[PDB]
Amino acid sequence: KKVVLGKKGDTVELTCTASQKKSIQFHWKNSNQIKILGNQGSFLTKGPSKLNDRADSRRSLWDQGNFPLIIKNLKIEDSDTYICEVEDQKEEVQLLVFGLTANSDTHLLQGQSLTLTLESPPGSSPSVQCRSPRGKNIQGGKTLSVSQLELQDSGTWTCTVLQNQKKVEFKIDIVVLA
Amino acid sequence: KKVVLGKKGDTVELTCTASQKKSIQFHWKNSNQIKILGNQGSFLTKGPSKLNDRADSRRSLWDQGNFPLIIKNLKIEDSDTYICEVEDQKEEVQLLVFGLTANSDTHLLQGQSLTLTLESPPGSSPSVQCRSPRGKNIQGGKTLSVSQLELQDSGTWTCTVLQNQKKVEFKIDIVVLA
């Protein structure tokens, strides 16, 4: 339903607003109906799941009817559909996690080729489109390449991943040396 | 409309959910219509106001239609009605800030009286009700007092401030010595 995009290693906050502003009853589960977190009494309980030590919520907001699921240090494998149920309300949020790495290690010399690769959830793939510090916008799919660099691209580029009308943005600084 | 209670020196997060999940146009102002924060383009702008260095929002949530106003290090004078307007939606949140201090400095001796006082927004007042580490629940208004303590109250008490169907909770540890 709602699509949220996140970046590998960053933290996301998936929202859940219900009615009757009050810490009433709710939980978040994943696609296999594994409960990730929910409220016990007025307490937060986290059962044993792959996200146990990386998930959490903001308890102060429960009185206002908000039950966020927060996930930190994202992994492409946290990509999944999550469901929030408050009393008798269900709310599906699909999280997609991507990563953009530069397989060109370090020390880049003029005339060298740059290759980037986008990491993505096996379940769903997008279109990436980067921009050099001075112009040219190379765009591709899971692998991008800039055949030969010129001292002018030394700088900080910006790639764009776009899934659903959503989008994330990575900015890497590349150093071309004479 | 929605009533949120906060504790002096703590941080609160006032919520604002609108529709069309997207960083569209919004701002938060106070009762004098002083804009506290809002979005410029895709950027956060804070104008000059008494809260400028203590307010903020969470930009990642704007794409999901959430525009929180976050306030830190609370002052009883931040108590006020705030309004969120997203496109053409208005949403009033009244924030009430209280404080509970122990005018009994330190070193409390058996048989001594304990006096607590609740600090509150000149505009609106509540009913406080504390609890000793072993029983008796003294309750009053802006000033509470425990005529004489007994080694048994050495511990950590819990006071309750209740405004609207809302409530905040302070827990102070008192030390009675022989």
Residue A4's H or E segment, with its range, is strand A2-7
Q: How far apart are the first and last CA of chain B?
A: 50
Kindly state whether residues A8 and A86 are assigned to the same domain.
yes
The experimental method, as deposited, was X-ray
d(CA B93, CA B28): 10
User: Is B178 part of a structural domain of the chain?
Assistant: no
Tokens of A72: 């930190």
Kindly state whether residues B24 and B79 are assigned to the same domain.
yes
Residue A22: phi, psi to the nearest 5? Answer: 180, 140
d(CA B22, CA B152): 56
Interface of B with A (CB under 8 A): 2, 4, 12-15, 17, 21, 58, 60-61, 63-66, 166
d(CA A59, CA A67): 8
Kindly state whether residues B83 and B104 are assigned to the same domain.
no
Kindly state whether residues B104 and B47 are assigned to the same domain.
no
d(CA B164, CA B3): 7
d(CA B156, CA B175): 8
CA A126 from centre of chain: 13
Q: Which of B4, B14, B21 sits opposite A2 (nearest CB)?
A: B21
Kindly state whether residues A53 and A2 are assigned to the same domain.
yes
What DSSP string describes A57-104? --GGGGGGTB--EEE-S--GGG-EEEEEEETTEEEEEEEEEEEEEESS
Among residues B86, B98, B89, which one has the least CA distance to residue B9? B98
Beta bridge partners of A4: A95
The one-letter amino acid at B124: S
Domain boundary among the residues A64, A98, A132 is at A98
Kindly state whether residues A89 and A19 are assigned to the same domain.
yes
d(CA B178, CA B172): 20
d(CA B124, CA B147): 28
What's B42's domain CATH number?
2.60.40.10
Kindly state whether residues A76 and A5 are assigned to the same domain.
yes
| DSSP 8-state class, residue A106 | S
d(CA B9, CA B168): 13
Kindly state whether residues A93 and A103 are assigned to the same domain.
no
d(CA A154, CA A106): 12
What DSSP string describes A130-149? -B-TTS---EESSEEEESS-
Residue A42: phi, psi to the nearest 5? Answer: -120, 20
Contacts of residue B60 in chain A, CB cutoff 8 Å? 12-13
What DSSP string describes B50-74? TTGGGEE--GGGGGGTB--EEE-S-
Q: Which of B2, B14, B61 sits opposite A15 (nearest CB)?
A: B61
DSSP-based three-state secondary structure for A31: coil
Q: Which of B14, B21, B61 sits opposite A13 (nearest CB)?
A: B61
Classify the phi-psi angles of B31: left when phi > 0, otherwise alpha if psi is within -120 to 50, otherwise beta.
Answer: alpha
Give the CB-side neighbour count of residue B37, counting CA atoms within 13 A: 21
Final resolution, Å = 2.2
Residue A120's H or E segment, with its range, is none
| DSSP 8-state class, residue B112 | P
Kindly state whether residues A83 and A107 are assigned to the same domain.
no
Kindly state whether residues B20 and B57 are assigned to the same domain.
yes
